[PDB]
Amino acid sequence: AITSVDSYLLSEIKPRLNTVLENCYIIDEVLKDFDYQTRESFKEAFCGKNAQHEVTVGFNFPKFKNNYEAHYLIQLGQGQETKNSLGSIQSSYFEATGDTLVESSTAIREDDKLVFTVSKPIGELIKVEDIEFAKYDNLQVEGNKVSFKYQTNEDYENYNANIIFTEKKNDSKGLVKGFTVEEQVTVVGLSFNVDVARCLDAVLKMILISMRDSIEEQQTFQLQNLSFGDIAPIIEDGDSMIFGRPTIIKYTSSLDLDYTITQDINKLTFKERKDWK
Amino acid sequence: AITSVDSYLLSEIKPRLNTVLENCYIIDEVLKDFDYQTRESFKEAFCGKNAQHEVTVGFNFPKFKNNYEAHYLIQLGQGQETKNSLGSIQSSYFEATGDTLVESSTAIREDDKLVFTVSKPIGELIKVEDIEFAKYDNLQVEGNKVSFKYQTNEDYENYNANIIFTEKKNDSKGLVKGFTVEEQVTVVGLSFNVDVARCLDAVLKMILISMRDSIEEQQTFQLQNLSFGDIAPIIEDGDSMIFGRPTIIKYTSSLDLDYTITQDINKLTFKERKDWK
Amino acid sequence: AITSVDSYLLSEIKPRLNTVLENCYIIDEVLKDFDYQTRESFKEAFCGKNAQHEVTVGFNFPKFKNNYEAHYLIQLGQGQETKNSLGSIQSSYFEATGDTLVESSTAIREDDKLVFTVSKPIGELIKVEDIEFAKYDNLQVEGNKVSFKYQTNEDYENYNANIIFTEKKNDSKGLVKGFTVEEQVTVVGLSFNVDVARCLDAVLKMILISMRDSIEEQQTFQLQNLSFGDIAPIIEDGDSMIFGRPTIIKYTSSLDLDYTITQDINKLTFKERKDWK
Amino acid sequence: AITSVDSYLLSEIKPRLNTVLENCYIIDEVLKDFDYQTRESFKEAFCGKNAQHEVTVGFNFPKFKNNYEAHYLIQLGQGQETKNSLGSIQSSYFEATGDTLVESSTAIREDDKLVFTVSKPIGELIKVEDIEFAKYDNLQVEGNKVSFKYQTNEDYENYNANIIFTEKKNDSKGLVKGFTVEEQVTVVGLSFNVDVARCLDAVLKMILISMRDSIEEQQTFQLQNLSFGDIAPIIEDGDSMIFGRPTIIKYTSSLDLDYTITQDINKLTFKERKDWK
Amino acid sequence: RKKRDNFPAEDVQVIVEGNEARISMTVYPIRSFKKISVSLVYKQQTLQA
Amino acid sequence: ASEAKQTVHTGNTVLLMIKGKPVGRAQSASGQREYGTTGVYEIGSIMPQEHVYLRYEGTITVERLRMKKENFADLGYASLGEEILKKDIIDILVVDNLTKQVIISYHGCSANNYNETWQTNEIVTEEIEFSYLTASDKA
Amino acid sequence: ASEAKQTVHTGNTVLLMIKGKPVGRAQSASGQREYGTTGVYEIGSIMPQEHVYLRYEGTITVERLRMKKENFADLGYASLGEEILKKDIIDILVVDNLTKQVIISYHGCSANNYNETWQTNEIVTEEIEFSYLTASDKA
Amino acid sequence: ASEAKQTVHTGNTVLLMIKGKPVGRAQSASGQREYGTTGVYEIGSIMPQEHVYLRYEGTITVERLRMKKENFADLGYASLGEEILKKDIIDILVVDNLTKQVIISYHGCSANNYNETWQTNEIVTEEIEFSYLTASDKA
Amino acid sequence: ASEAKQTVHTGNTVLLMIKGKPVGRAQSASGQREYGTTGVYEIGSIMPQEHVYLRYEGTITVERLRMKKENFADLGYASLGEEILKKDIIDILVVDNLTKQVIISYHGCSANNYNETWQTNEIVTEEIEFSYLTASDKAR
Amino acid sequence: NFADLGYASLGEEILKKDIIDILVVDNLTKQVIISYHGCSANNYNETWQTNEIVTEEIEFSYLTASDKAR
Amino acid sequence: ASEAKQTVHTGNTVLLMIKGKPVGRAQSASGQREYGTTGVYEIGSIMPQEHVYLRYEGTITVERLRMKKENFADLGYASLGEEILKKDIIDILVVDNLTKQVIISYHGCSANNYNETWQTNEIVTEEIEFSYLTASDKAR
């Protein structure tokens, strides 16, 4: 697909940041190496459900004033194409497949089959969690349902699973045409307190490490590489300075389009014609 | 873990600097190559218990005035990730282990065992100083105690040892996920006297050499590499100039998180089911 | 040891510069390639015992006015660590050894031995000049004296020698821990006369070539490497310009500390203990 | 020796420039590629014995006004040491030898020898032009004279030759200690007429090509390498601009000193001494 | 080389002085015995047949 | 956005597992494989008539940073001395990090050589090479 | 912060010791090891049936800056001439710098070759290679 | 400050001498040495039982800038043609520059090959290699 | 291992000696020995009932680089013509290089053949073969 | 050596030898794999070389062989 | 070592000469010698009581690159046909190249066989074998 690393990072960082900040022992583990007073002051101010201060995330160049006490500024950077395929063919498909998804589901009995229901039509099934079927189990997929023989499996009549699958758009042939790009985004934790900037740096590094395992950047946005700048005053001529430490996140990812092929051939036919010269 | 090289350096330098400055013959050895008058003036001013002047250490950008006669300014620099593991698996553990520790202890008799007591639960024992036990000695560890058979060892009933060990957090499985970073910190000895700046440079180099043997940067913060700047005026438009010579300390270290695994499997079970086709 | 290249250079250059300038035919040889009038004017002004002008040497940033007619400004530069040892063990010693020394001495008869007396306790004897002893000569060293059998050597009863040796500090074991550094110092010959600057450049290059053979930079400060800048006005807005041509002297040297080991073991002992199981 | 590339270039360029400019057909050959009017105007103005204008050569930073119509400004540049010898021994000698010289001379008869007389004591004879002597000819050198047997050579009693030789300073042993340096000098032909600057560039390139064969830079100053800058206004805010095109001449040369050795040994002596134990 | 065709490095001394080098060898003359020292050790041996 | 229709494996996507433990700090794995394909020639043409497979061979080579604990020597998979004679064959699995699903199995690995390099500006490196009896994947 | 659960050896973490003296200014040590693993084949399949160990071999190579004293030649471990015939085997220990605890022992080392390089812009380098009878670690 | 307890030789610290003359403008010297160490094996174990020294070999290689006088050819140490048959063996000494004290002696050198390279942007280079009968040091 | 500690003999650990002088430039020596061992068979079994020794024979071969002096021809240990008739039998010893203890003596050696080869760019070689009467662990 | 251990002969002593049994044996269990019974020497051979280990070779004729010791 | 100082002869240190002229392009020479040495045995011992010489025989082989002139056929030292009957025996000398002192003479050489080989891209070769009567350290 076409991709937007900045909007991915914003969407991914915001919930993760919230869920760490609402959970005191995570911060208590992340900041174990800092000075005791720095740790306790940060945990008192920003952390837990009762926290009176708050962190914020957003893109650069807003028209309004931000929470300069603690704010992650996201800042889309450079990139370049790095590797190309022969014919620019990144892949080919017989059935137009959408995004990868993971969904929780439960088995139910139906007509002496077990079935799992999924919210969308299954374009491909990658994994039913914790199950490997035998041929006897007569595994079949149909529409948005996975179906599974009941006879030997009655103990599992309400078994709970996670389905990893991917959507289908439509039944069509085509070529995925495109290339790989290596692209940079900068993130900086702004604070007018230097110890807050240093803690926001630690929290962001933890978040990015945790992010490396996510399906989003396992399937796309691969090879996350991190670089770190000096701590410096970002703005120097207010009533106080604003400090930050930049980090650069670099990703390798595919830019591509679905070139559908309308041509289809369903019968050869043969004829002999005679040359009398 | 997540780590903070700047706070490590501050915590490590301050006590070492104090303990050198309170000990005259150490300075007399460090400064043996300097001019006699430079050496004696520095030793008279800053050195020994009666020293009327003092050195100081702290981070950059304080809001107050510093001891510009002699001050080590610590200044967190750049870094970049350098080496990654397959799957980002830095290690794996069956029991969540804390920091490495070294503690002095003495043997005591208890119920015809010798035991050493340690302040914290022993997650792993690395070394009992100057002892290698045989199987006959029935070495066992339990909780925060090391225990050792009395029968043949009665002469050692009050033996004094150092225990090198590491804490345990909890009994849980997981993967240490992370990567290696190479990171820089700058340190500069500010003085309005150039000969004091040159002596502070010598003392800092001695301190860093001594630091290379510490457990902190043997286990973490490995491959200390030093670079040195020119001596120059840091500030030039007071009633006097302030001079310093920067040094850059570069360290290689691991950034990682404990991804605990809750899944555990404690019995396989087998069944045969018959296919009548 | 810890070392100070700038103070070494000042201490080494000043006497050598004086001893060349008091010796006319040396300058007459050094300046043989210059224009006749340049050579004779320099030799008339600065050279010989009657010289009314004088050259001077000192570090940069003095608070007073200098002899801008001819002045060598010494200016401590950059450096970086270049090569490390395994375990940082630069060496090891059984007896704490000081600096290397060379001293003139004469033999004397004492109790039918010849002896040479040295000003300091001999930690190690490297060479007695122009002598190689046989086993029959019963060479022995004791304290600050070297002793040598008289019987066959009576003709040498007043022989004059140079002893190359090194001090001992004390009888102790340890490890020399440290690393190698490559470090730069700049030197510039300031003069308001351009032909004087060019002659000061020639004299300095001669001095550094002569310095390469000295024990100081044979044992330490090895691999002297020279670079040369353009001739340019150092200061441009007086009643006259001040000119100079920089040279950069680069040295490779060891930074290290004596880590003494107090542990000593002087007897193993063996015991058999019986296991009745 | 110590050397001064700038003064060499000034001394070498000035006579060569004069001797080309006094010789019209040389300029007519050098400028054959230029526009006819440029060539004829340059030849009319600066060239031949009747030339009313003149070119000039000198170092940069004079205190007086120069001939900005046509002036070669010589400007000493950077350099660095490039290759070192083991022990810094550039060579060794049994007899202190001076500069290389070439002198014209004529044979004369003396006591039934032919002799050539030379202005200085011959330290070494490299070549008598156009002669190779046989052993029968009894070639001998003595003081400042070369001597050659008359008997078979009477036809050559007034033969005219060139002697290539080198001076001797004195009969002494030593080591030539030093190193090789690669050094740059810039030369620019200033003129307020751009076509004069372009012609001065052509003439200078011709002069340097011719210089490559000279003994001075065959024996020293080897590996002449030329680089050329853009033509640009050197000064821009007079009543007219002054133009020039820089050239950089780079040379490889030896810097070294004669370390004489006073020690000489002229007899070994052997003795047997008996050990009665 | 000579002793291969036909001396211990510990037994030659060299002094150089004033353009002159004296090389001094040790040499061993023939004395006559005044003392004989015999150390007699009684061992014992297992015979077998 | 995450798409399956194109995806490549990467150093972060793949676990290496031996005896059900992941190998920490593994730097590379190189799998090589050969079938001995021999061409058939005859009198009457210069062309190859056929190709035949005659001898299967393959190796797996692993580079790793030498940890202070759980080395290949401490894990027992490597051998320093004669105890190589007492090591049974082991199976090396390369596994998808997301799905925990086996990508390729190397069966019957047996050590050819083992190296350690100690160097002054670097982390210490283990490297080991195994011959294996076969490889397979299951899906 | 200092953690044991992950740690790697580095040039600064490891002492090299011979006869109970540390070797100063050692620049590298390279240990190599080979078992002669030979595959068994038979009529009836192209697959290897088995692997067998047939011949152990290994070497330890050390590079060092040539000191003015206590060279391998001055220490006596190296040999320049026929006196190689009079050098007994020596054991080379690689030891943890912090704990003073043996990481690996090379037993029965015997010199294969010895080099010195004298060069004009560099420090002089010793290099030596030993064959050894076995290697082991103890814990 | 000058310390003996640590010191390394360097290109500036060491003279090269032949027949009591220093060799000017020598760029490198490389000394190499081999003992033919052969391992002993037997039926009953894969381990080496012993190592034996069987054949000593060594060479000294010298690179030098070709001077206009006192080349190896002009000094007579090198040979261009059949006169190699008339050159006796020579001893090459490597000597401490400060103390004038012999560091290592190569005895019985005999020329293997001799090279000269003439090139347009460079100084001309001599290179020569000798086989030698033995090497030694004295202290 | 030190030469004093090797368990196996090697070329440097041994010397070849004739008439009490060491044989220089010796390249190889090969010693062969046969006993004529013959199996006895009889009617009623296909298998040898015993083996018996019949005839001892042995030869020692020595190969060397030809020296400019002290060749076998120059030392009188070999013959080129009639002079073979005026030779007499000699003893050849292989000896421990350290102790000069004898390892093997070959007794009563008499020459079988003598051979020389000349080559453009190689060292000249000598080879000689002696038959001998007996061998022993000790000198005669 | 075989000569030192008395398993080989150099001269007349061959007449005073007698037949011997040679076993090839499992290194783990010390179970016999093959016995050769009644070995008697046919020839004995030695070779000396400048830069190699000295070699011995011996050939015995034998009466019978078995999977087991006598 | 200088050629004047080598202890071993080498191909360059020796010359091959026939009738006082040097044999050019000589590639190799091989000299073989046998004495017919036979061991005597008797009833009562398995061991040879002594060895005796019976029949001397020897052959000298020479191999060369074939020259365009002065071949063995051209010089008359070899035969192709009937002319063998009109040859007579010759002496072949191996001689010290420095001093021209004789090292070995082979006396009364008579040809056994003569051989030639032609090849697409190689130098042509000659080989000749003579039987001889006697050999000596000296010329006849």
DSSP letter string over C195-213? Answer: HHHHHHHHHHHHHHHHHTT
Neighbours of chain G (3+ CB pairs under 8 A): B, C, D, F, H, I
Taking a C-beta distance cutoff of 8 angstroms, is the pair H66, H123 a contact?
yes
* Other CB atoms within 10 A of residue D145 CB: 16
A210 touches chain B (CB under 8 A): yes
What residues does A228 pair with on adjacent strands? A247, B79
Taking a C-beta distance cutoff of 8 angstroms, is the pair G135, G107 a contact?
yes
* Amino acid residing at D228: F
Q: Do residue I34 and residue J48 have CB atoms under 8 angstroms apart?
A: no
Q: Do residue H46 and residue G55 have CB atoms under 8 angstroms apart?
A: yes
Contacts of K49 (CB under 8 A, 6+ apart): K40, K41, K42
Handedness of CA C227, C231, C236, C240 (dihedral sign): positive
Taking a C-beta distance cutoff of 8 angstroms, is the pair F133, F108 a contact?
yes
Taking a C-beta distance cutoff of 8 angstroms, is the pair J59, J43 a contact?
yes
User: Exposed/middle/buried for G23, CB within 10 Å: 0-12, 13-18, 19+?
Assistant: buried
Taking a C-beta distance cutoff of 8 angstroms, is the pair C261, C173 a contact?
yes
Cα-based torsion angle of the residue sequence C57, C62, C65, C70 in order, rounded to the nearest 10 degrees: 20
Taking a C-beta distance cutoff of 8 angstroms, is the pair F13, F95 a contact?
no
Taking a C-beta distance cutoff of 8 angstroms, is the pair H95, H102 a contact?
yes
Taking a C-beta distance cutoff of 8 angstroms, is the pair D189, D204 a contact?
yes
* Amino acid residing at F43: I
Of C65, C183, C178, C232, which is closest to residue B231 (Cα–Cα)? C183
Q: Do residue F121 and residue C84 have CB atoms under 8 angstroms apart?
A: yes
F122 touches chain C (CB under 8 A): no
Question: Nearest CA to CA, how far is D266 from chain H (Å)?
Answer: 14
Question: Nearest CA to CA, how far is H45 from chain F (Å)?
Answer: 9
What residues does D115 pair with on adjacent strands? D108, D147
Q: Do residue B136 and residue C179 have CB atoms under 8 angstroms apart?
A: no
Which helix (H) or strand (E) element contains residue D11?
helix D5-21
Helices marked H in chain F — which ranges? 72-75
* Other CB atoms within 10 A of residue D238 CB: 10
G88, two tokens: 């007994």
Q: Point out the residue among I115, I122, I131 whose CB comes nearest to the CB of K33.
A: I115
First to last CA, chain E: 55
User: Exposed/middle/buried for G6, CB within 10 Å: 0-12, 13-18, 19+?
Assistant: buried
Taking a C-beta distance cutoff of 8 angstroms, is the pair C217, C184 a contact?
no
B153, two tokens: 């060892």
- Do G and D count as touching (3 or more CB pairs closer than 8 A)? yes
Neighbours of chain D (3+ CB pairs under 8 A): C, E, G, H
Give Dmax over CA atoms of chain F in angstroms: 65
Q: List chain G residues with CB under 8 Å of I1.
A: 88-89, 110
Q: Where are the beta strands (DSSP E) in chain B?
A: 56-59, 71-83, 89-93, 96-110, 113-117, 122-128, 140-142, 145-149, 160-170, 173-190, 222-228, 232-235, 242-244, 246-261
Q: List chain G residues with CB under 8 Å of H46.
A: 35-36, 53-56
- DSSP code of H10? B
Neighbours of chain E (3+ CB pairs under 8 A): C, D
Q: How many CB pairs under 8 A join C and G?
A: 48
Which helix (H) or strand (E) element contains residue D40?
helix D36-46
Of K41, K58, K59, K61, which is closest to residue K50 (Cα–Cα)? K41
Of I66, I80, I77, which is closest to residue I118 (Cα–Cα)? I66
* F126 three-class SS: strand
User: How many angstroms separate the CA atoms of C211 and C213, rounded?
Assistant: 5
Which helix (H) or strand (E) element contains residue C29?
helix C24-30
User: Exposed/middle/buried for B170, CB within 10 Å: 0-12, 13-18, 19+?
Assistant: exposed
* Chain H: residue whose CA lies nearest to F84: H46
D120, two tokens: 């200085």
B203, two tokens: 């003392």
User: How many angstroms separate the CA atoms of C60 and C75, rounded?
Assistant: 6
First to last CA, chain B: 57
Taking a C-beta distance cutoff of 8 angstroms, is the pair H134, G81 a contact?
yes
Residues C3-42 as b or e (16 or more Cβ within 10 Å = b): bbbbbbbbebbbebbeebbeeeebbeebbebbeeebbebb
State the method.
cryo-EM
* Chain A: residue whose CA lies nearest to F138: A132
Taking a C-beta distance cutoff of 8 angstroms, is the pair B159, B104 a contact?
no
* Substitution target from H52, H54, H85 for chain I, most I beta carbons within 10 A: H52
Interface of C with F in 72-131 (CB under 8 A): 83-86
Q: List chain G residues with CB under 8 Å of B93.
A: 5
* D190 three-class SS: strand
User: How many angstroms separate the CA atoms of F14 and F96, rounded?
Assistant: 5
The two beta strands, F102-119 and G26-34, are antiparallel
Neighbours of chain F (3+ CB pairs under 8 A): A, B, C, G, H
Neighbours of chain H (3+ CB pairs under 8 A): C, D, F, G, I, J, K
Q: Point out the residue among D83, D84, D86 whose CB comes nearest to the CB of G118.
A: D86
Question: Nearest CA to CA, how far is J55 from chain H (Å)?
Answer: 12
User: How many angstroms separate the CA atoms of I18 and I5, rounded?
Assistant: 27
Q: List chain F residues with CB under 8 Å of H47.
A: 82
* Chain G: residue whose CA lies nearest to B216: G2
* Chain C: residue whose CA lies nearest to G100: C87
Taking a C-beta distance cutoff of 8 angstroms, is the pair F104, F136 a contact?
yes
I50-to-D118, H21, I38, I39, J70 alpha-carbon distances in Å: 106, 79, 9, 6, 17
- Do B and K count as touching (3 or more CB pairs closer than 8 A)? no
User: How many angstroms separate the CA atoms of K65 and K117, rounded?
Assistant: 10
D82, two tokens: 């490039």
User: How many angstroms separate the CA atoms of E38 and A183, rounded?
Assistant: 94
Alpha carbon A6 to chain centroid, angstroms: 12
Q: Point out the residue among B34, B136, B241 whose CB comes nearest to the CB of C275.
A: B136
* D219 three-class SS: helix
Which helix (H) or strand (E) element contains residue A42?
helix A36-46
What angle do helix axes C194-211 and C5-21 make, rounded to 10 degrees? Answer: 110
Q: Using alpha carbons only, how large is chain H's radius of gyration in Å?
A: 19
Q: Do residue K46 and residue J15 have CB atoms under 8 angstroms apart?
A: yes
User: How many angstroms separate the CA atoms of B118 and B123, rounded?
Assistant: 11
Contacts of D102 (CB under 8 A, 6+ apart): D162, D163, D164, D165, D215
Of G110, G106, G105, which is closest to residue G77 (Cα–Cα)? G110
User: Exposed/middle/buried for D56, CB within 10 Å: 0-12, 13-18, 19+?
Assistant: middle
What residues does H28 pair with on adjacent strands? G119, H63
Taking a C-beta distance cutoff of 8 angstroms, is the pair A181, A81 a contact?
yes
Interface of H with D in 62-91 (CB under 8 A): 65, 67, 70
User: How many angstroms separate the CA atoms of I124 and I115, rounded?
Assistant: 11
User: How many angstroms separate the CA atoms of G113 and H35, rounded?
Assistant: 6
Alpha carbon H123 to chain centroid, angstroms: 22
Taking a C-beta distance cutoff of 8 angstroms, is the pair I88, I19 a contact?
no
Contacts of K22 (CB under 8 A, 6+ apart): K15, K16
Q: List chain C residues with CB under 8 Å of H98.
A: 164, 213, 215, 218
* H82 three-class SS: helix
Q: List chain C residues with CB under 8 Å of H11.
A: 223
- Do J and I count as touching (3 or more CB pairs closer than 8 A)? yes
Q: List chain F residues with CB under 8 Å of G41.
A: 55
- Do J and C count as touching (3 or more CB pairs closer than 8 A)? no
Q: Do residue I2 and residue G110 have CB atoms under 8 angstroms apart?
A: no
Q: Do residue C100 and residue H3 have CB atoms under 8 angstroms apart?
A: yes
Q: Do residue F110 and residue G51 have CB atoms under 8 angstroms apart?
A: yes
Q: How many CB pairs under 8 A join D and H?
A: 48
Taking a C-beta distance cutoff of 8 angstroms, is the pair A70, A200 a contact?
yes
Alpha carbon B37 to chain centroid, angstroms: 36
B35-to-B43, C19, C112, J64 alpha-carbon distances in Å: 12, 21, 44, 95
- In the block, residue with structure tokens 């009643």: C239
Helix, strand, coil % over all residues of chain I, rounded to 5: 10, 50, 40
Question: Nearest CA to CA, how far is F85 from chain H (Å)?
Answer: 9
Contacts of range K22-25, beta carbons closer than 8 Å, 24 or more positions apart:
K23/K62, K23/K64, K24/K64, K24/K67, K24/K70, K25/K64, K25/K65, K25/K67
What angle do helix axes B194-211 and B36-46 make, rounded to 10 degrees? Answer: 80
* Other CB atoms within 10 A of residue A122 CB: 20
Handedness of CA A241, A245, A250, A251 (dihedral sign): negative
Q: Do residue C213 and residue D3 have CB atoms under 8 angstroms apart?
A: no
* Other CB atoms within 10 A of residue I44 CB: 6
Q: Using alpha carbons only, how large is chain B's radius of gyration in Å?
A: 26
